Amino acid sequence: RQPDEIDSMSISNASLLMAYALGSSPDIEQQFSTGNTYRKPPKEASYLVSEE
Amino acid sequence: SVIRIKTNAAVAAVLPANEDQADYPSTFFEGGNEIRLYVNRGEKLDVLRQYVYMGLVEKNCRIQHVNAYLYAVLKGERELLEADWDSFGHKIGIQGDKIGPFNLVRVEDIPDGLPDGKLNAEVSAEDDAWLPLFLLGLYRVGRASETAYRTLLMESLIKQCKAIKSDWVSPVTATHKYFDVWGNDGNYLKIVACVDMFYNHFKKSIKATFRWGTIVSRFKDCAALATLGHVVKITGLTIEEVFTWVLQTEVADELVKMMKPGQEIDKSTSYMPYLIDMGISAKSPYSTIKNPSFHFWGQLVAALCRSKRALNARQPDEIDSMSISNASLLMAYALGSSPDIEQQFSTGNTYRKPPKEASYLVSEEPKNRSVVEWIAWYSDVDNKPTDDMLMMAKRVAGTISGPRDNSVGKWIKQTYG
Amino acid sequence: SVIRIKTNAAVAAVLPANEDQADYPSTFFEGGNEIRLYVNRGEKLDVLRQYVYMGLVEKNCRIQHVNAYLYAVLKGERELLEADWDSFGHKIGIQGDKIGPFNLVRVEDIPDGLPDGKLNAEVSAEDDAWLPLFLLGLYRVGRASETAYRTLLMESLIKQCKAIKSDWVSPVTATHKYFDVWGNDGNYLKIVACVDMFYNHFKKSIKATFRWGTIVSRFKDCAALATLGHVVKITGLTIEEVFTWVLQTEVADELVKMMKPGQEIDKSTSYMPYLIDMGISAKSPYSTIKNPSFHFWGQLVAALCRSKRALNARQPDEIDSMSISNASLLMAYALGSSPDIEQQFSTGNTYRKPPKEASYLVSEEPKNRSVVEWIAWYSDVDNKPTDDMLMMAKRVAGTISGPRDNSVGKWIKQTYG
User: What is the dihedral of CA B90, B92, B96, B101, to 10 degrees?
Assistant: First the structure.
């Protein structure tokens, strides 16, 4: 149920920003390994797609 | 090193309500080494078989009768041990002696519950060929609730109409569910488990036909192990190679909890598969419900890999479905971009002789199935699926002629398609 | 040789629940063990012939009667052994002797189980031209369960209506299945196997017509051998060349276990074809269920090579089908891109006269069927099928007018098409 008398216009906007962030950066980290490495992350600086 | 949360003035620590854990089969045998069966022993076999045979003719068959009879007919069926049989520290039999079907559990005398009524019918001194098979067969029929409940009784009647000569009236009701009570009796679950584990060891014995209706008791509520084995066979990867692809931190903790060493999950002829029916453990940790976030992973990977069996796997609500589905498509699109394609036999010729020229920059798609090379490749696309990648997902979506509701097949249709 | 698996702290055990293997014909007869047919003898032939006819006219034709009768009527049909007959070390007959149909197995008189009842009807005593053929032929009707169950009886009725003169009453029921029980009797399976193996050797004998209805006993639960033989004929490759194409590491493992040397798999005059009916093994290693991933391989290749029988080949659940289908399509498109075209006869003229080309830059498509040239060719396209390659797959998809509910026939239509 959508609760009447809330900032429905703004709360829906903040919710979409959080939902689109979880999908654009999923919980994607390897866990197990057989003696192989860890993708050696070099900490990216900037992608110009949407500076996402 | 926990991270504290503050606000515009002060800290506000947060913790929600908890949830329940699971039990393990091995912990029960540290002080309570012996299982406790309770069957009525003292009445003669022929009197017990007729107490059941008139309870079977009536849609009102009590459970104390079926337990007392099955202990009588199935107690002399001893068989030769060709090799020591010892699991979880409780040895069952030394080499060269005949053990019976009931030496797997201590047979304690029943609490005073001697069966009432059901006056004996005519002489059925030859009906032991089917009676244990029928009463054991209702456990399989007691389970199914859908139209398979109709199919199984017809298959069960064939198993016993073949048993005597030709004639067999069918006392069993077509659709009444009075024998569903039998699955709630803890002693009846133990005798049903003893018949299956015993004849799984002596598969060559003539009485192995009784295993119908009790084979379902083996590896019960352990579907998470079947999911791990299903992924290994369909993916073509080794069991170790499947573990490296567990891209979620939460899915690994659920996969780790099932792998606790001293549980004898490996090797047959163990007490672990029958942990629940024997009472060895409540709510088995290998059940699908106890580790849902791992159950969706892999089963979705098997789907995307054209399983057709994973498509009817109820997607478990309350998991990181948005992220688990992304790791599955990357794993599924890696298995198709590097098929298990290696020469095996040879008539005297050589191999593709790869010289490893650093890499090809077409889409720098790795030519191997190693997770490390693929995760680094997937980061170049900002961890968002590529065109080609969604295109395979629509190809898998086209095989789902009709999904089951709220299933993995519905998930592939709504998300990827 | 297991590899170790770590996480962010510690190692994790990597073993799932196990499963069981199959037996081999050679391991039996390792002690010199004899097959032991166990049938009740000592009763007169004519009374057993009448005990059977007075059960056959009714819907209750018990099997102890048919076993005792078939041993009586069919023991003495001896035939001229023109050459030594020796399988698995247990010699059957020396050259030049009258042999027999029942000397392949020890007679081993049964513990007293003599059939009761069914008093004799009128005397025929000359109708053995059809009676063994019907009871042996009724085993074949025991198998089919669909409308072919009706078609086989029509073939059985014509075989015996022609047997007497013109007249033939048909005691057999049109559809009742009281004789489906007969296939579970171990003695009946042994006698039905002896008639087929005996008359497979003496094909010229007049009583070889009895072989109808027992031919189903040959290579039973050995469909993987029929699949391996089918690919050699449909693809046109030599049996050696088919082994070289096994692009999956798993498909090789079934062929290795299927080829165990001392099993007399090649020899006709051997005990191997009757693995199930003779009791030599309780689970043939050559069954389709015992060798998955090989059964999907080849049968999909036979499909893709436009075989009409492979389309109804049960796709084995729980395999790496996504990878096998890629290797299968690559093999099928190689047989079509270089058909066996070498000239054979000649009037004194020559052949395609190749002057050592060694390299054409069209698509470097090899002109031969060697696996090595195709694997290197497939590696240049990153082990993904080409346009031209899928275009052949759509061509095979258009001939699949209607698939059954699953199997490879769904594969060519659903994925490649």
Answer: 180
